[PDB]
Amino acid sequence: FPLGGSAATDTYSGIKANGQTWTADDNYEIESGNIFAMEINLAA
Amino acid sequence: ATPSMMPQWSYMHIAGQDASEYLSPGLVQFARATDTYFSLGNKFRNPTVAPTHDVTTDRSQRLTLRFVPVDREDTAYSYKVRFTLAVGDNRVLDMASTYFDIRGVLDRGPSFKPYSGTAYNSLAPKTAPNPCEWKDNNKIKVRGQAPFIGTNINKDNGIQIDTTNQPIYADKTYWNSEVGAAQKVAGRVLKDTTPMLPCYGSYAKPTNEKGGQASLIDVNLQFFALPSTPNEPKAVLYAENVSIEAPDTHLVYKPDVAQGTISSADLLTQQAAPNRPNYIGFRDNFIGLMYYNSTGNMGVLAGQASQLNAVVDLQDRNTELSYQLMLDALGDRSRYFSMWNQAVDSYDPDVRIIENHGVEDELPNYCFPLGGSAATDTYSIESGNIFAMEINLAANLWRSFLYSNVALYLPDSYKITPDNITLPENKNTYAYMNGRVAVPSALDTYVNIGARWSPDPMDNVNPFNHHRNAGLRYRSMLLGNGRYVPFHIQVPQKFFAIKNLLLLPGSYTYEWNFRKDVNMILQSSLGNDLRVDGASVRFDSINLYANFFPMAHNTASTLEAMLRNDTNDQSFNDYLCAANMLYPIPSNATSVPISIPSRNWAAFRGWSFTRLKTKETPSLGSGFDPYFTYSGSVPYLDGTFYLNHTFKKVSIMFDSSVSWPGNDRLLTPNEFEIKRTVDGEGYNVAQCNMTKDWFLIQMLSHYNIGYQGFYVPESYKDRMYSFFRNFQPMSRQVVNTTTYKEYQNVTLPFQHNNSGFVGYMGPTMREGQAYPANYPYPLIGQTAVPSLTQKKFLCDRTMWRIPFSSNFMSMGALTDLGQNMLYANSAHALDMTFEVDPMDEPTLLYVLFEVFDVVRIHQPHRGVIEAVYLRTPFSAGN
Amino acid sequence: FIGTNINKDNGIQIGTDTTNQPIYADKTYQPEPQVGQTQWNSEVGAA
């Protein structure tokens, strides 16, 4: 596994009055899909 | 069959004559002649008829009688049960089998951790930023992670999984070369009110039947998307407000500018770690619980209607170290019994005498991308070998062994506490012995590379407080893996005079004050003050338990009217016949002037030196002596002798005109020398630094050969607490400190062998720039610095003997020169002086002046125990 | 692998006295050969 556990890009917000709007609260980070990986056969 | 059957039996010698008899006398001689070849022995069966009459009763005697206390008080420092033994008639007890039956709760304190490492979220980067919500400048919130693709997200119901199927709220958590997340994603974040710990120890209690963390009084569902098009619903995160904690963690790089606040960007990085493992459990054969040898709080076995006493206990002998030796001298203590909690203390012989022999790596131990290959091109498919990556596995395992078993068990002098986390100041509780990191450059793979060496700075630490005290291990697991533990003991009886007494018919009483002093009745694996950090052993029920031999009344009558005659009386001796006395060697002192005036040495069969450390040798017998703040092995009543390889001289000297060495036997005339540190002009023996006459004199006493050539004494004469198994001799070489012209020393920061690749001074992480090195100094290669050798004498778990005999042999119990009128009729006065090596802190030497212990219990009437308790060569009488 | 050119119907010049393509019974050999003999600079896709 990687040290941090992600290599992600960005994501802003949405409160969505019928229109996924925004969320002052949040402010421009999510990396979709499980963590990057690295594999070893530590027994063989 | 017949109503007798005897004949029908004998025709198979099933119960009849022995083969030596029915065989024709001619054949017996032939079978007794050719028995070393072609033996006719295993085919003509014998018999085995066992005794029909007068061996067993018919009318009474439950095998294991159950006596109940006729008394009980909870002093918080003892539990004085007063039983009432009622061994009947035609009936004998043989007080060996007289267990007690302790039962009650035991609360191991917030210092108990059997899982030697982490048992919580374990396989994980111990730098992981637990998906958090790093709050901020009223800037409001931020990052984390996620993964449950989904397709549709509708507001107030996130991840679309007839109908839409509209997922549940609580439960959202849990390729080859694929995944490729297009088409919505989601996950679950941690809200910015939960202390964002690392991922290596984090745990929030369930609080949700369907698994997920949640505060029961819960959470906000929140959105965010990609800047590419920031008006259309992207991934959705079900954050929450967990009860995040970590009940095994001693974070070693808490980014230390975080005063007041809890969550902030400068704190996603927190290299956690597993707290050093405390084993906890009861002591070997319960060396504690049983106030043995405290004349104040001492039991009794006096006949009922005399109630005088039958167990007179001095404060000289230690009957708790004279049982833990008799076990060695009778069976094999290395075998684990559980009722007595028989589990000898120990120490992985590969982590006391560290042999850094070396890793076994030659080819790079390599990484490979999850599926087949890595990122690649598109044309007429990777170009060149796969993306690769490496770990020298054989080295990481060795480094973990070193600074997980030896390199962080060092004295709290070579241990810089983590960067700036706040510790307590009482450096004896488990708040300062696990907040102690151990520099990996003190002990590490490149430490005395290739030579067996218990690293110098841990020579003086004791071996038996360790991960692998296999016996700290089979008493810390046998009871249970828990903070709280009910328990049900079977403590034995060890008093030499009351541990085999036959107890003829009578009505004897029985009393014995147990100890409720946790931290003295409860061992440890790191040295603690259990009483302060939290610990207690609440007793609930004590009961005696005796196993009767169902002896036929008409034969027990004989054996009881015959064991009462004056001549036919018992007699017992402590296996460790001694007159134990402790001397207070001060800190940083090289001497121990001892003395004894005008004695009448009559059977003094030989001294026995030793050397304990104070903190951990208990207070003698008073009671709750508070100055006891150790939890480790008790070399005073544990048998574990670690600070034993430090003696340098003994100078026995009688009247004030002599030298018991004697005339001139001793090789360095009458000045016993146990070590020649630098002056070895012909005289040190093994390649150790022992002196040829302090071996000649141990292997002469302890085993029994020094005049016929040393020959690795027989297996059955070096049982555990002996000399030879623990004579481990060792040696090094070191850079000549003044010939290697360029020896510019390099201390423990400044040094640098692993470069970037590993720590900077901690058990931190990879931060560097790999240049070459400079601290391991080459002692082994074509470019090797000139070397000065150094020698050591690790020898523990044994007591230096120096028997009182002319030959210095063991030709009998009453030693030769313990019978001579020069000593056996007149009176002298011993004045010695030992020259032990500067230790460093308090340190009591444990001279074990040896005498003849003996008791002559006898029961003339029905219920009268009277016994003499003489101990010569250092007796008790005015 | 990483050889020189590839000829129409030729293979890839493994390399020797003026051409030297390889035995398509194996010669691509795979299972073995490939740069690593220049690892941390291996540098593939040259030209």
Give burial (CB, 10 Å; 0-12/13-18/19+) of B372.
exposed
- Alpha carbon distance B352, B463 (integer Å): 7
For residue B404, the 8-state DSSP code is: I
* Alpha carbon of B231: minimum distance to chain A alpha carbons (Å): 5
With touching defined as 3 or more inter-chain CB pairs under 8 Å, the answer for chains A and C is: no
Between the alpha carbon of residue B729 and those of residues B353, B639, B790, B792, C46, the distances in Å are 9, 21, 12, 7, 61
Enumerate long-range contacts of B668-677, CB under 8 Å, 24 or more apart: B668/B693, B672/B697, B672/B802, B673/B648, B673/B649, B674/B647, B674/B648, B674/B649, B674/B650, B674/B800, B675/B647, B675/B648, B675/B649, B675/B793, B675/B837, B677/B648
Contact B443, B325 (CB under 8 A): no
Nearest Cα residue to B198 out of A4, C26, C37: A4
Breaks in chain A follow which residues, C to N over 2.5 Å? Answer: 28
A44 close contact with B: CB closer than 8 A: no
Ordered alpha helix ranges (H), B713-795 = none
Chain B, 456 to 475: residues with Cβ < 8 Å from chain A are: none
For residue B26, the 8-state DSSP code is: H
- Alpha carbon distance B522, B43 (integer Å): 56
**What is the number of other CB atoms lying within 10 angstroms of the CB of residue B534?**
17
Rg (CA), chain B: 35
Between the alpha carbon of residue B4 and those of residues B16, B48, B50, B53, the distances in Å are 13, 18, 17, 17
Contact B693, B665 (CB under 8 A): no
PDB experimental method: cryo-EM
CA B343 to chain centre: 9
What's the distance, Cα to Cα, between the start and end of chain C in Å? 13
Contact B648, B668 (CB under 8 A): no
Which residue shows structure tokens 């982490």? Answer: B118
Q: Which residues pair with B730 in a beta bridge?
A: B792
Between the alpha carbon of residue B29 and those of residues B12, B17, B34, B45, B446, the distances in Å are 22, 17, 9, 17, 71
B375 close contact with A: CB closer than 8 A: no
Q: In terms of CA atoms, which chain B residue is nearest residue A43?
A: B393
Which residues in C lie closer than 8 A to residue B377 (C-beta atoms)?
Answer: 45
Between the alpha carbon of residue B609 and those of residues B578, B581, B662, B798, B873, the distances in Å are 12, 10, 19, 10, 17
What are B153's two structure tokens? 């997200």
Burial track B744-775 (b if 16+ CB lie within 10 A, e otherwise): eeeeeeebbbbeeebbeebbbbeeeeeeeeee
B768 close contact with A: CB closer than 8 A: no
Contact B114, B476 (CB under 8 A): yes
**What is the number of other CB atoms lying within 10 angstroms of the CB of residue B712?**
10
For Cα atoms A7, A13, A16, give the angle at the middle one, nearest 5 degrees: 145
- Alpha carbon distance B144, B415 (integer Å): 35
Nearest Cα residue to B91 out of B62, B67, B50, B68: B62
For residue B268, the 8-state DSSP code is: S
For Cα atoms B733, B735, B739, give the angle at the middle one, nearest 5 degrees: 130
Q: What chains are in contact with C, requiring at least 3 Cβ pairs below 8 Å? A: B
Q: In terms of CA atoms, which chain C residue is nearest residue B377?
A: C45
CA B584 to chain centre: 26
* Alpha carbon of C8: minimum distance to chain B alpha carbons (Å): 14
- Alpha carbon distance B202, B196 (integer Å): 9
For residue B406, the 8-state DSSP code is: I
* Alpha carbon of B217: minimum distance to chain A alpha carbons (Å): 23
C-alpha dihedral (B9, B10, B16, B22), degrees to nearest 10: -160
Nearest Cα residue to B108 out of B298, B350, B281, B326: B281
- Alpha carbon distance B358, B395 (integer Å): 8
What's the helix, strand, coil split of chain A in %, to 5? Answer: 0, 5, 95
Sign of CA dihedral B471, B477, B483, B489: negative
| Contacts (Cβ under 8 Å, ≥6 apart) of B364 | B390, B392
C6 close contact with B: CB closer than 8 A: no
**What is the number of other CB atoms lying within 10 angstroms of the CB of residue B271?**
20
Mutate to test the interface with C, among B383, B387, B389 (most CBs of C within 10 A): B383
- E strands, B736-793, are 787-792
* Helices (H) then strands (E): counts for chain A: 0, 0
For residue B277, the 8-state DSSP code is: P
Q: Do B143 and A24 touch (CB under 8 A)?
A: no
Coil vs helix vs strand at B134: coil
Coil vs helix vs strand at B617: coil
Between the alpha carbon of residue B523 and those of residues B101, B480, B499, B530, the distances in Å are 20, 14, 25, 9
Breaks in chain B follow which residues, C to N over 2.5 Å? Answer: 161, 174, 217, 380
Q: Do C44 and B384 touch (CB under 8 A)?
A: yes
Q: Do C35 and B384 touch (CB under 8 A)?
A: yes
A17 close contact with B: CB closer than 8 A: no
DSSP H/E element including B733: strand B730-735
Q: Please give the single-letter amino acid code of residue B628.
A: F
B380 close contact with C: CB closer than 8 A: no
Which residues in A lie closer than 8 A to residue B126 (C-beta atoms)?
Answer: none
- Alpha carbon distance B609, B605 (integer Å): 14
| Contacts (Cβ under 8 Å, ≥6 apart) of B38 | none
Give burial (CB, 10 Å; 0-12/13-18/19+) of B605.
buried
Pairing of strands B509-514, B484-488: unpaired
- Alpha carbon distance B57, B38 (integer Å): 46
What does residue B410 show for φ and ψ, rounded to 5 degrees?
-75, 165
DSSP string over B681-738 = SS-B-SSSS-BTTTTTTTTTTSSS-SSS------GGGS-SSSSGGG---EEEEEE-TT
With touching defined as 3 or more inter-chain CB pairs under 8 Å, the answer for chains A and B is: yes
B383 close contact with C: CB closer than 8 A: yes
| Contacts (Cβ under 8 Å, ≥6 apart) of B761 | B416, B439, B441, B748, B749
What are B804's two structure tokens? 């009182």
B363 close contact with A: CB closer than 8 A: no
Pairing of strands B843-845, C6-7: unpaired
Give burial (CB, 10 Å; 0-12/13-18/19+) of B282.
buried
Contact B586, B838 (CB under 8 A): no
What are B286's two structure tokens? 């319960």
- Alpha carbon distance B645, B863 (integer Å): 50
C31 close contact with B: CB closer than 8 A: no
Which residue shows structure tokens 């010669």? Answer: C27
Contact B13, B45 (CB under 8 A): yes
Contact B242, B204 (CB under 8 A): yes
Counting Cα atoms < 13 Å in the Cβ hemisphere of B726 gives 25
Which residue shows structure tokens 């008829």? Answer: B49
* Alpha carbon of B366: minimum distance to chain A alpha carbons (Å): 7
Q: Please give the single-letter amino acid code of residue B501.
A: L
* Alpha carbon of A7: minimum distance to chain B alpha carbons (Å): 9
C46 close contact with B: CB closer than 8 A: no
Ordered alpha helix ranges (H), B732-850 = 821-824
What's the distance, Cα to Cα, between the start and end of chain B in Å? 75
Q: Do C34 and B384 touch (CB under 8 A)?
A: yes
Count of residues in chain B: 878
- Alpha carbon distance B368, B390 (integer Å): 9
Count of residues in chain C: 47
B377 close contact with C: CB closer than 8 A: yes
Q: Do A3 and B234 touch (CB under 8 A)?
A: no
Q: Do A9 and B232 touch (CB under 8 A)?
A: no
**What is the number of other CB atoms lying within 10 angstroms of the CB of residue B274?**
21
> What region, left, alpha or beta, does residue B808 occupy, with left being phi > 0 and alpha being psi -120 to 50 degrees?
left
What does residue B599 show for φ and ψ, rounded to 5 degrees?
-85, 180
